[PDB]
Design a protein around this ligand. Structure first.
Ligand SMILES: C[S@@+](CC[C@H](N)C(=O)[O-])C[C@H]1O[C@@H](n2cnc3c(N)ncnc32)[C@H](O)[C@@H]1O
Ligand SMILES: C[S@@+](CC[C@H](N)C(=O)[O-])C[C@H]1O[C@@H](n2cnc3c(N)ncnc32)[C@H](O)[C@@H]1O
Ligand SMILES: NC(=O)CC[C@H](N)C(=O)O
Ligand SMILES: NC(=O)CC[C@H](N)C(=O)O
Lengths: 274, 274
């Protein structure tokens, strides 16, 4: 099985070079390898699938890069979220698995109350907003303080054919959409909620810091948002940090807290849609 | 002396973490520090320069990032070239010192034969082209196969008030400007000339591979350029590898090869301006 070995021997060596950086070293290597050969994952099994000395060196270089902690998805240029391919790159936060659960709850709520207008603060790549626009009929108003996030969220909205229902503007909270505030029925968000003093793992070291830190508390976004806006008549669903429930209850009243599929508190839900 | 102890002790610890990654260890830390503090390098001495525990942590994180081999200029977001500050980021090649000497020779020939039209192939961040427009009267036609490079080159063009003399377009070689071909009196370029088999230093590992490699030989760009364009009545000045002179003589005849300030062969000059 001439070529069958070689590629799989290579796969294993690389996998070994990545452990200590990721528990899913084999998966990552498979992804890096198919990306460099220009084939879909599935074709990694094709008989007589070859790797030239150039493609081999490229793979070793990308593996050496990933070994430094650099994000796998920055290397891939994309991250799958809700089954959709979101373009990502340096300067943009990479969508996380827990945020998918926030979107599924948002969709269930949109179905339930026949909601038509949604907001996505801190849209980043557009993960939450674009997905909502993709699997519902709602229109979405998104914002981000990052110029780079706005341009990327636009591309991602266009990429999935929802540019007609997903609008993003640069700025903080909902300031760029003052004229639409009254009309917004649901406000979603996965804001920066990491404590200033929190230790950053090697890979998050490469993500935008403005996407992570929420002050000493890691609650600055919540305090300022709930302090400045009137949530009357609206529904607010936001992702939070495992240990912020008690402190959050003192920032916004009548709030409900739901947990992950991992059993950790992950979402705050305020329903003032009387 | 008290507040000076804080910052200067930090700078020393940081430098320690960067040895083995760079010989200009302390210079880099000085650049990184003045960036998170929002001041010029020249003000690092000042009176009482303090570092909040937040700025301290950010500095340590950026040093931890540089420690991985991540390019210093990607962290800084800029590179000084010809005394001008050029924006750079992932996806764009960081201007190199040597290329400054190519530009000086370019301004030499422009302010001699009184040249008015210049081309810059593979402009990257625009260092060569933009600098030429900024220090002379000639206009420049820049190109690059990198969409990312095109946008940055353009930004740097506006950033230096030369958007009216610097025109960049996506595509390879001079195709995107074919109709201006006869108009161009001088063709400048710092193309990819690294052998596809060459070892990549830790930080080069983070730059665009299309900006580095020129085939097994390292001379692909040259071979294709000279075998496609008639250089009659034009001056061609390009950067080359230090070990490519002899093989390059077999690709283009009647060419002169100039040396670095470091004694290495770095440029090829074909003057056919009759
Ligand atoms: C964790 S990231 C978002 C990632 C993306 N929403 C997701 O779910 O994958 C948080 C984003 O909030 C943005 N951000 C931070 N403060 C903000 C504010 N006050 N208003 C709007 N956006 C903000 C950042 O630029 C960052 O992209
Ligand atoms: C070594 S970098 C140039 C660095 C230099 N500091 C500058 O400002 O041009 C080479 C650039 O050439 C571009 N390039 C590579 N092949 C090319 C081609 N066939 N035609 C035009 N540009 C090309 C790349 O996208 C890359 O940005
Ligand atoms: N929302 C945030 O604070 C961004 C980071 C996110 N909690 C994560 O580590 O996946
Ligand atoms: N234009 C080039 O290929 C010069 C790049 C330079 N040899 C480097 O690797 O730093």
């Amino acid at each position: 099985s001439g070529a069958e070995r070689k590629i799989w021997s290579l796969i294993r060596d690389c996998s070994g070079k990545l452990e200590g950086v990721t528990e899913t070293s084999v998966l990552e290597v498979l992804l890096i390898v198919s990306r460099v050969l220009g084939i879909r994952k599935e074709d990694l099994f094709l008989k007589d699938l070859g790797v030239s000395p150039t493609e081999e060196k490229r793979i070793l270089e990308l593996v050496e890069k990933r070994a430094s902690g650099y994000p796998l998805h920055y290397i891939l240029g994309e991250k799958e979220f809700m089954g959709l391919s979101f373009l990502v790159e340096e300067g943009v936060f990479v969508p996380r698995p827990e945020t998918e659960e926030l979107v599924e709850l948002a969709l269930e709520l949109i179905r339930k109350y026949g909601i038509k207008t949604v907001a996505d603060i801190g849209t980043g790549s557009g993960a939450i907003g674009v997905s909502v626009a993709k699997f519902s009929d709602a229109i979405v108003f998104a914002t981000d303080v990052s110029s780079k996030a706005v341009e990327i969220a636009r591309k991602n909205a266009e990429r999935h054919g929802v540019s007609d229902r997903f609008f993003v503007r640069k700025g903080e909270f909902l300031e760029p959409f003052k004229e639409k505030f009254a009309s917004i029925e649901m406000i979603l968000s996965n804001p920066p909620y990491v404590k200033s003093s929190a230790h950053l793992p090697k890979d998050v070291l490469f993500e935008p810091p403005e996407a992570l830190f929420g002050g000493e508390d890691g609650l600055d976004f919540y305090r300022e948002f709930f302090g400045r806006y009137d949530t009357s008549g609206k529904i607010v669903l936001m992702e939070i940090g495992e240990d912020q429930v008690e402190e959050l209850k003192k920032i916004v009243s009548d709030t409900v807290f739901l947990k992950d599929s991992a059993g950790k508190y992950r979402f705050l839900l305020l329903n003032r849609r009387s």
